[PDB]
Amino acid sequence: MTEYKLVVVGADGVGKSALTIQLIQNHFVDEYDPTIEDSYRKQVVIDGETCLLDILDTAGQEEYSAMRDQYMRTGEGFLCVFAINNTKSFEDIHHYREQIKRVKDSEDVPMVLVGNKCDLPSRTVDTKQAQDLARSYGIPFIETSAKTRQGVDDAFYTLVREIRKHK
Amino acid sequence: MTEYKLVVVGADGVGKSALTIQLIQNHFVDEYDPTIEDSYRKQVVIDGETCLLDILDTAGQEEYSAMRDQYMRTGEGFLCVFAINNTKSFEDIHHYREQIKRVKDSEDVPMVLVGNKCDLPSRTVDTKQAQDLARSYGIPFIETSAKTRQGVDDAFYTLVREIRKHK
Numbered sequence: 001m002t003e004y005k006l007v008v009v010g011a012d013g014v015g016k017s018a019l020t021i022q023l024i025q026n027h028f029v030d031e032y033d034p035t036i037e038d039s040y041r042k043q044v045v046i047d048g049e050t051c052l053l054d055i056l057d058t059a060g061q062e063e064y065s066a067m068r069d070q071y072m073r074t075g076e077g078f079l080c081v082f083a084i085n086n087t088k089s090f091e092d093i094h095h096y097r098e099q100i101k102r103v104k105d106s107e108d109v110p111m112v113l114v115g116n117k118c119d120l121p122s123r124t125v126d127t128k129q130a131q132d133l134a135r136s137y138g139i140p141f142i143e144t145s146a147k148t149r150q151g152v153d154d155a156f157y158t159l160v161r162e163i164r165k166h167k
Numbered sequence: 168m169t170e171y172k173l174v175v176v177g178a179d180g181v182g183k184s185a186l187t188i189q190l191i192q193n194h195f196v197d198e199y200d201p202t203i204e205d206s207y208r209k210q211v212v213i214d215g216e217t218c219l220l221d222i223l224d225t226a227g228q229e230e231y232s233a234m235r236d237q238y239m240r241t242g243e244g245f246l247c248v249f250a251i252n253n254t255k256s257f258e259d260i261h262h263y264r265e266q267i268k269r270v271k272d273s274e275d276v277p278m279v280l281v282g283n284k285c286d287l288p289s290r291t292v293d294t295k296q297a298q299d300l301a302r303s304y305g306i307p308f309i310e311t312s313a314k315t316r317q318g319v320d321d322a323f324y325t326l327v328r329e330i331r332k333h334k
């Protein structure tokens with residue numbers, strides 16, 4: 001058995017909690033209830049290895065920069081989430097990646113860029129634009145929908161694979 | 168901590184959803200997606216008190232006005248929204264205010280008159296005209312733009328202050 005500390009980060013309302021709740025509880029959260037900080041455990045098998053995922057579901061906006069830095073130091077891998085209908089959340093990605101790199105004092109940190117709400121037709125961030133950004137960061141990119149469950153398992157499992165590769 | 172049940176009402180397309188989404192998610196929705204009924208939570212500090220805002224984003228549908236009675240009974244305060252480029256929506260305000268007063272069986276219901284889309288130069292409702300009407304209603308008036316965020320926080324916070332005053 002191996003434990004993996006995963007952190008889900010991103011702007012207000014991108015679907016951080018809905019993505020995590022889909023992985024843990026296998027259903028969609030339709031309601032909008034802002035997160036302060038929650039954590040969840042999930043035991044899963046990834047590439048034949050027994051994994052205990054310890055997932056931190058973070059707030060869109062931190063109250064204390066120093067409190068935020070602590071989970072970035074502890075976290076082994078980061079799911080950097082934006083919503084495909086929210087250009088501000090996509091532009092905010094750089095700020096999350098820069099904060100993670102600074103706290104970890106490393107240019108190489110396991111990360112996955114997640115483009116959530118891909119079920120929505122009202123797209124403002126194109127697929128190629130997110131693919132190019134992820135290519136420039138040297139990280140995988142996955143489109144997800146916490147509503148339909150599209151790409152949810154793949155986003156978390158890819159992050160675990162990135163952590164296992166880094167180790 | 169205190170919870171406040173806020174209701175955003177007004178005619179079709181005045182920007183009820185865009186105002187609420189700007190308040191909580193800090194981005195402007197350019198798309199027009201008609202609302203059936205959505206609710207959102209937002210934790211804020213107003214005059215030193217932590218407020219958990221429970222905001223109901225309602226439909227602009229003019230048909231079956233009786234469908235509004237239950238949320239009008241439950242709601243503690245109302246954001247009565249019109250668009251500054253839509254004279255019909257400004258004239259419709261009276262119908263929303265009359266229904267609220269009837270359902271609540273009170274002339275002193277916490278309300279704020281909101282003149283949305285103030286970023287638009289194609290104005291048909293003058294600021295002074297809405298100020299004059301709001302004064303005759305005995306309620307505050309705030310101009311807002313879900314696009315620029317002008318007056319968005321002030322509209323919701325003023326409504327909370329009106330509910331507190333009423334208590």
Ligand SMILES: O=C1N[C@H](c2c(CNCCCCCCNCc3[nH]c4ccccc4c3[C@H]3NC(=O)c4ccc(O)cc43)[nH]c3ccccc23)c2cc(O)ccc21
Nearest residue numbers: 168169170172173174206208219221222223237238241242
């Ligand atoms: O004040 C505190 N609240 C905290 C707390 C919570 C968390 N709550 C989170 C919001 C929950 C929204 C629930 C959907 N609320 C949805 C909602 N939002 C509205 C806004 C306006 C009008 C109606 C609604 C409605 C709907 N409700 C109706 O009756 C209705 C009718 C017609 C409609 O069409 C729509 C609606 N749960 C607790 C249980 C016990 C004690 C405290 C709490 C708390 C903790 C604490 O340490 C100290 C103080 C507090």
Ligand SMILES: Nc1nc2c(ncn2[C@@H]2O[C@H](COP(=O)(O)OP(=O)(O)CP(=O)(O)O)[C@@H](O)[C@H]2O)c(=O)[nH]1
Nearest residue numbers: 013014015016017018030034035060117145146147
């Ligand atoms: N259409 C659609 N809606 C989604 C998707 N993911 C989340 N949502 C919706 O977006 C809203 C916010 O989702 P939530 O998971 O709370 O986002 P969050 O980023 O955790 C909010 P906070 O930053 O305050 O913790 C909810 O109404 C939820 O149903 C998705 O993939 N598609």
Ligand SMILES: Nc1nc2c(ncn2[C@@H]2O[C@H](COP(=O)(O)OP(=O)(O)CP(=O)(O)O)[C@@H](O)[C@H]2O)c(=O)[nH]1
Nearest residue numbers: 179180181182183184185197201202227284312313
């Ligand atoms: N320029 C400008 N456009 C706005 C503003 N607020 C809303 N809009 C635009 O008006 C249209 C309708 O916005 P929306 O928030 O859906 O209005 P609504 O009142 O919730 C519509 P419904 O009654 O069906 O729920 C959208 O195209 C939106 O971009 C604003 O402050 N400025």
Ligand SMILES: [Mg+2]
Nearest residue numbers: 016017034035
């Ligand atoms: Mg959340």
Ligand SMILES: [Mg+2]
Nearest residue numbers: 183184201202
């Ligand atoms: Mg709407």
